[PDB]
């Protein structure tokens, strides 16, 4: 039902090929603040921030209303590790905000053998990001 899963580099490529494509960071405010965020300044646009889950881990029941308010064709959804963003992509799709894509591996990726993230995901592949 949602348009597809794309890897972090594919997401960057899609944004770079489509001036009206939108990156929606759906992580909670605590992750934006303490972990960091993608940086689209080199593409002359802003990231759209709408929490899927709030920082207590529970769903933002105003997500759709906020999403429709805050966007800006392709709309690309980014979570911590690529999994909870599928729900956001499905909500976008059902709202006719399409094509809606999910970023595999997310911003931080999976927990590796040492109990560390930063192995896969947006930052691991060095796509533009900032935490100050
Ligand atoms: Br679609
Ligand atoms: Br990749
Ligand atoms: Br476009
Ligand atoms: Br979060
Ligand atoms: Br916070
Ligand atoms: Br925003
Ligand atoms: Br998320
Ligand atoms: Br994970």
Q: What single string gives the DSSP state of each residue in 93-106?
A: HHTT--SEEEETTT
* Closest ligand to Cα 15: 3
- Experimental approach: X-ray
Domain count, the chain: 1
CA distances from 71 to 27, 64, 118 (A): 16, 11, 28
- Prior bond of 41 cis (ω within 30°): no
Q: Which domain CATH number covers 50?
A: 3.40.250.10
Q: How far is the CA of 1 from the centre of ligand 1 (A)?
A: 6
Which ligand has the shortest distance to the CA of 100? 1
CB within 8 A of 80, min separation 6: which ones? 27, 31, 35, 106, 107, 108, 117
Q: What is the distance between the alpha carbons of residues 52 and 59, in angstroms, rounded to a whole number?
A: 6
Task: Provide the 10 A C-beta neighbour count for residue 91.
Answer: 18
Q: Tell me how far apart the alpha carbons of residues 83 and 104 are, in angstroms, rounded to a whole number.
A: 8
In which domain, by residue range, is 55 found? 1-132
Q: Which ligand is nearest to the CA of 126?
A: 2
């Amino acid at each position: 039902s949602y348009a597809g899963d794309i890897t972090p580099l594919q997401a960057w490529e899609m944004l770079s090929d489509n001036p009206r494509a939108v990156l929606v960071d759906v992580r909670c405010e605590a992750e934006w603040r303490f972990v960091g965020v993608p940086d689209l300044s080199s593409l002359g646009r802003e990231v759209v921030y709408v929490e899927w889950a709030t920082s207590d881990g529970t769903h933002n029941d105003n997500f759709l209303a906020e999403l429709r308010d805050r966007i800006p064709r392709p709309v690309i959804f980014l979570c911590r590790s690529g999994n909870r963003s599928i729900g956001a992509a499905e909500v976008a799709t059902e709202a006719g905000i399409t094509p809606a894509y999910n970023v595999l591996d997310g911003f931080e990726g999976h927990l590796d053998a040492e109990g560390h993230r930063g192995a896969t995901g947006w930052r691991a592949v060095g796509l533009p990001w900032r935490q100050g």
